[PDB]
Amino acid sequence: GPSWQAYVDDSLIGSGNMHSAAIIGAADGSYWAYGGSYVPQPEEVQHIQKCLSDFSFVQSSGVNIYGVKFFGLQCGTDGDCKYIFFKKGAAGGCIYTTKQAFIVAVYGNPGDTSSLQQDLEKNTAHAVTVNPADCNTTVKRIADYLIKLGY
Amino acid sequence: SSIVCDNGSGMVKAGFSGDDAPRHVFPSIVGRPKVYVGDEAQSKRGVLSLKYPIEHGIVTNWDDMEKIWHHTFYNELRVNPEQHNVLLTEAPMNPKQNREKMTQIMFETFNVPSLYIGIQAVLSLYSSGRTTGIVLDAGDGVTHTVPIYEGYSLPHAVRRVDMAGRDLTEYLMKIMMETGTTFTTTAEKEIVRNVKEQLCYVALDFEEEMTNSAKSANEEAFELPDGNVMMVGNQRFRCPEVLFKPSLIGLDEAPGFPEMVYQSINKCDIDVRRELYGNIVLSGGSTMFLNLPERLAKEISNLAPSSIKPKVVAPPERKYSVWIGGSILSSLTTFQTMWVKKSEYDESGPSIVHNKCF
Ligand SMILES: Nc1ncnc2c1ncn2[C@@H]1O[C@H](COP(=O)(O)OP(=O)(O)OP(=O)(O)O)[C@@H](O)[C@H]1O
Ligand SMILES: [Ca+2]
């Protein structure tokens, strides 16, 4: 069967648009599945839950994952999906809610400066970096699929 | 080969990526026989009704906007769209529908290979060499304060004021009427616009400027095309003062440039606050008045906390900053994978720019 961990392993992290992902129970905060190092701790899960109930918490304090503070960029509702976009240096990610859960994804290195800022300083030919839009789109397509299934 | 087209409420700036300045700058109007676009519609206000496709930075009528784009690709740039990636610009908080319509027009009417829509203030910030800061963009029909972190704007902290250069020119006409001379014809309004763009300046000390202009009878001489001389007095610094005191035109709900920057910053996460104060980037034609950056710096320093020293960035090329950053962004290696290809449009539809362009 298509396990929750397989979604994290193959559908989320396995897409290449994120190095960490976690599917988390919306009310109980339980870890349905998680992968990578940038997975929110229980106290960080409760903060995300409070953020999903009040977007002004994201604007004033962002979200914390793996002990790292990420700045909130933009929140809203994409239909049945509540979304939160965050960023920290070259890293960032998104939170997308489903019917009874939400997905947290993280890409990039937060201790590094963004590749666009490095190119602005010195435009050098380098390897392809993760597009934050691709991370958002992958999680959005997944989240839309669970909502269609009812999860 | 990549195209950069910055569509403003008054002026369109079109050029190629990699260049340091827009190669074609022309008014954003459409003239209809009582169809013509650009400088020629400007010069022919006798058989033509003039329309502005973009109002306050937002596209209002799409037929004339398509005409502007047609005149930009073929009559100005003299190029075929299918052979060139086009980077387009939009105002902050652009309605989702409008982005979908411009995407569909670019990908279907012009069958462009790839397309990207970027926020104008973000492009200005790129032109300033940083990806984090607050941009004050003041043009002809709209003014925005946009906080931005790592190349992404913070929409909850953006402020829009529907007042800019056109309102300033109208106010200059009004306050020049008090000398006994009226400015109602086309040529007279042209003279007023020229006086605003050439003689007006921001007073470093408004009350001291009033005193020095009243006690010394300081008046500047503007030469008219016919050789006659027009004396302009304190109006030179009373017109752009509206940008700092919008209540001069009854715009009490507009806070003015320093308080605009202050309130936008104060709506942000305080962890970024300092970095926003240290990178206040000015862009747009209405930021080009003399002493405007220094006055804004003094006021924002008076408002900021004690442990914060704000810094205003204002290069002599502010008016085209949005374009320059664009031509810079389309030149970076990271951006090459950020283009929205036509295949993605055929797959997901016009809504794809909601995910790829944020
Ligand atoms: N040197 C100058 N000093 C003052 N005002 C100027 C100067 N040069 C241009 N302007 C004014 O700036 C405006 C044009 O600025 P800009 O090209 O940035 O606007 P836009 O892109 O057409 O409009 P918007 O950003 O409002 O959609 C006009 O009102 C023009 O009169
Ligand atoms: Ca503009």
Residue numbers in the entry:
A (entry chain B): 0 to 150
B (entry chain A): 6 to 39, 52 to 375
Q: What did the paper state?
A:
Along with cofilin, a handful of other canonical ABPs are present in Leishmania and Trypanosoma species. These include the small actin monomer–binding protein profilin, which is found in all eukaryotic organisms that contain a regulated actin cytoskeleton. In animals, yeasts, and plants, profilins inhibit spontaneous nucleation of actin filaments, promote elongation of pre-existing barbed ends of the actin filament, and prevent assembly of actin monomers to the filament pointed ends. Profilins can also accelerate the ADP-to-ATP nucleotide exchange on actin monomers. Besides binding actin, profilins also interact with polyproline-rich motifs, which are typical for actin filament nucleating/polymerizing proteins, such as formins.
